[PDB]
């Protein structure tokens, strides 16, 4: 249920 | 240094809603 | 946090979320002690009974957060771990004695209204504040009940409890590297840390210099918010020489 974090953080 | 001084509280001289409860316990 | 309240914005700017990359989930709480160092509980990273043994690449640190699940664009900062350091005498076999770990960040975090380090106590701070009856503050995104999950960071203020009362509440052996906090059944008021709050800070505001000090780390308990039981915390000052050695390098 966690929102996706930007790709840059791996 | 500036450790433990919150930009939105101590740095502005604003108190959060329950910090007085802690202070009152330090008898 | 059981029987706490929602945090105010910027209330705990040293609050860190330890976040597992896969599956994407909350691993633990933690705290910001400088622009490059994060303090947590060793059991967040190493706990053989539950096959927990995280390495640097397994997780991320999310700083400046309030919402548990949302990506807080322009507010939270996400950092990678360079290296983990677990206390060499951490006792995961019995009672979590010396439940402490340090994490060095790959790059320094920028401070903001939402991101700011907490102080670590010196001998005098600890002697003056770590007294039975004196209240501290625990924060985290852990369970709201022993047996859901909060939308935002939770806060609870709890009194430090007398060492004999801590000892008499449990069959577990208590050491000088831990202290217990919480209300007694006769006090009426409730509150405790719970699963998912592990590694988070137990803080006190010094009435001497008006700064917040991290006196404890959420470590263990037996269930959450049970009558006659108390939450146990790693005694930060007792382990400061280890902290100082690791940071000095
Ligand atoms: C609810 N849980 C999971 C337990 O009571 C497990 N109970 C065990 C425990 O707490 N452990 C082992 C790793 C760590 C953990 O789960 N920490 C999460 C936590 C944090 C706060 C509190 C609290 N203040 N009430 C309780 C648990 C303890 C059981 C007695 C011997 C020491 C370990
Ligand atoms: C944990 O993982 C490391 C590999 O990162 C391994 O060397 C170590 O023996 C493991 N177990 C314990 C209890 O440290
Ligand atoms: Na006992
Ligand atoms: Na209790």
């Amino acid at each position: 249920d966690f929102e996706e974090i930007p790709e840059e953080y791996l | 240094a500036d450790c433990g001084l919150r930009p939105l509280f101590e740095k502005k001289s604003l108190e959060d809603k329950t910090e007085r409860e802690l202070l009152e316990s330090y008898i | 946090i059981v029987e706490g309240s929602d945090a105010e914005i910027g209330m705990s700017p040293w609050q860190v979320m330890l976040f597992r990359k896969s599956p994407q989930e909350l691993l633990c709480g933690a705290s910001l002690i400088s622009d490059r160092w994060v303090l947590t509980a060793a059991h967040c990273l190493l706990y053989p009974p539950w096959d927990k043994n995280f390495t640097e690449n397994d997780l991320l640190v999310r700083i400046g957060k309030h919402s548990r699940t949302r990506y807080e664009r322009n507010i939270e900062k996400i950092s990678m771990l360079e290296k983990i350091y677990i206390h060499p005498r951490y006792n995961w076999r019995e009672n979590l004695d010396r439940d402490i770990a340090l994490m060095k960040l790959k790059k320094p975090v920028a401070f903001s209204d939402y991101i700011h380090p907490v102080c670590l106590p010196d001998r005098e701070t600890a002697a003056s504040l770590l007294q039975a009856g004196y209240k501290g503050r625990v924060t985290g995104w852990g369970n709201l009940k022993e047996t859901g999950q909060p939308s935002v960071l939770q806060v609870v203020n709890l009194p430090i409890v007398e060492r004999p009362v801590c000892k008499d509440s449990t069959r577990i052996r208590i050491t000088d590297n831990m202290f217990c906090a919480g209300y007694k059944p006769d006090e009426g008021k409730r509150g405790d840390a719970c699963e998912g709050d592990s590694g988070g800070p137990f803080v006190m505001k010094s009435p001497f210099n008006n700064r917040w000090y991290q006196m404890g780390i959420v470590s263990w308990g037996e269930g959450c918010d049970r009558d006659g039981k108390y939450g146990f915390y790693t005694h930060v000052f007792r382990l400061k020489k280890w902290i100082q050695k690791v940071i000095d390098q």
Side-chain angles (χ1 to χ4, degrees), chain C residues 36-42 45 56 81-88 100-105 242-243 245-247 249:
Chain C
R36 275 194 85 161
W37 291 95
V38 171
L39 182 64
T40 195
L45 302 162
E56 294 75 1
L81 304 184
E82 179 182 302
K83 191 76 188 169
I84 285 157
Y85 303 88
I86 297 161
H87 195 289
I100 195 164
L102 284 161
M103 296 171 292
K104 188 175 188 190
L105 302 184
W242 173 77
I243 295 175
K245 183 196 167 176
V246 170
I247 293 157
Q249 276 140 298

Side-chain angles (χ1 to χ4, degrees), chain B residues 1-3 16-17 21 26, chain C residues 8 116 119 135 137 211:
Chain B
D2 62 355
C3 72
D16 67 59
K17 293 166 189 165
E21 178 189 354
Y26 307 156
Chain C
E8 292 170 56
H116 198 88
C119 308
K135 295 169 175 184
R137 176 178 286 172
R211 291 176 191 265

Side-chain angles (χ1 to χ4, degrees), chain C residues 22 24 27 44 51 81 163 165 167 187 196 208 215 219 228:
Chain C
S22 64
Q24 268 208 0
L27 203 132
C44 285
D51 296 291
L81 304 184
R163 178 186 166 93
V165 175
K167 186 175 137 57
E187 287 164 332
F208 304 96
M215 305 314 294
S219 181

Side-chain angles (χ1 to χ4, degrees), chain A residues 1-6 8-10:
Chain A
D1 76 323
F2 281 85
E3 194 183 353
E4 188 65 40
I5 67 141
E8 70 189 288
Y9 307 116
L10 269 71

Side-chain angles (χ1 to χ4, degrees), chain B residues 1-12 14-23 25-27, chain C residues 8-11 13-14 112-113 116-119 133-137 157 183 204-205 207 210-212:
Chain B
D2 62 355
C3 72
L5 297 165
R6 304 171 290 181
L8 294 178
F9 293 97
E10 290 77 22
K11 297 277 190 182
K12 283 165 105 131
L14 295 177
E15 281 175 16
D16 67 59
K17 293 166 189 165
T18 64
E19 60 171 281
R20 197 164 289 279
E21 178 189 354
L22 307 185
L23 174 62
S25 75
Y26 307 156
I27 61 168
Chain C
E8 292 170 56
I9 301 302
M11 193 190 217
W14 34 78
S112 80
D113 281 351
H116 198 88
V118 70
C119 308
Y134 277 42
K135 295 169 175 184
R137 176 178 286 172
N157 297 332
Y183 291 105
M204 300 178 84
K205 183 171 165 164
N210 310 90
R211 291 176 191 265
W212 291 88

